[PDB]
Design a binder for this molecule. Structure first.
Ligand SMILES: *C(=O)[C@@H](NC(=O)/C(=N\OC(C)(C)C(=O)O)c1csc(N)n1)[C@@H]1N=C(C(=O)O)C(=C)CS1
Length: 268
């Protein structure tokens, strides 16, 4: 029956991909869950910026921080190898906490993410916030710089915990309404995953997403929320691909095809 056999189809889409692949698809309103290796913790790379943004917004909601607090960013905060977004960080600049979350989510900025990581108390504090919220299978152990000088101790998370996190975000149970609207607005405008969760959906499908990419196709990740048409609800979806044999383009196409299969199963 269409959602019953989604696991069969997902398993054949990723067959012979090699590596380690975790998938979780959760229908937000009903809770219907489809998972493949859904409890295995896999390298997150830039996907960790989504738990980071939640921990930052929890700090504001727990009255230890403000959205409009000015934070000074200097070229000293940019790691050497960070080439993608470094153009905004060449002379000292003041950004509000809201603006730091913005650029870290939309542009997958490493510099602003590491600044936010310090504001909340480092990797251990984010890991604690995750279990305090109900997601004990998300372990943040490294800053972005630390991990960049040696890929050995990566931040990991299971696909099911990321999807469950997105379910509560979409439902309005995770953050205050204005913080939920603010974060989903950022994720709707994210520009790093045009070929992934959005790649194969029908024209006009709203998608909020956060990607993760390692160099040379070592890791290709995408987690997000797909708005179904009609009044059919939302899909929280996490795809974590680690160490695949496939080329980068084919790994992105794997994510796009997984999303379209989950979309098709849950739409009438
Ligand atoms: C999150 O996953 C970030 N990724 C990285 O910092 C790494 N590589 O980034 C790219 C741009 C793919 C590169 O070729 O250098 C990375 C860190 S440790 C490792 N083995 N690789 C951000 N992701 C992207 C993206 O395009 O998804 C960015 C635009 C900026 S860094």
């Amino acid at each position: 029956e269409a959602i019953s056999m989604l696991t069969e189809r997902l398993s054949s889409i990723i067959n012979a991909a090699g590596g380690d692949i975790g998938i979780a698809v959760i229908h937000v309103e009903t809770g219907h869950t489809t998972a493949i290796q859904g409890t295995t913790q896999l390298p997150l790379y830039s996907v960790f910026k989504l738990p980071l943004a939640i921990a930052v917004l929890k700090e504001i909601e727990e009255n230890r921080l403000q959205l409009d607090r000015k934070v000074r960013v200097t070229p000293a905060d940019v790691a050497p190898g960070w080439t993608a977004n470094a153009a905004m960080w060449r002379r000292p600049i003041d950004r509000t906490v809201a603006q730091l979350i913005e650029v870290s989510i939309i542009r997958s900025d490493n510099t602003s993410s590491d600044k936010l990581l310090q504001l909340v108390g480092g990797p251990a504090a984010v890991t604690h916030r995750m279990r305090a919220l109900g997601f004990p299978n998300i372990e943040i152990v490294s800053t972005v710089r630390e991990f960049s000088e040696n890929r050995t101790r990566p931040n990991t998370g299971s696909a099911e915990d990321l999807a469950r996190l997105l379910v509560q975000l979409q439902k309005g149970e995770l953050l205050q309404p204005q913080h939920s609207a603010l974060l989903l607005g950022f994720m709707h405008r994210a520009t790093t995953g045009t070929e992934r969760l959005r790649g194969s959906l029908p024209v006009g499908t709203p998608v909020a997403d956060k990607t993760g990419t390692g160099d040379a196709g070592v890791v290709t990740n995408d987690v997000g929320i797909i708005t179904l048409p009609k009044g059919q609800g939302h899909l929280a979806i996490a795809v974590l691909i680690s160490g695949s044999k496939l080329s980068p383009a084919a790994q992105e196409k794997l994510i796009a095809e997984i999303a379209r299969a989950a979309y098709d199963a849950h739409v009438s």
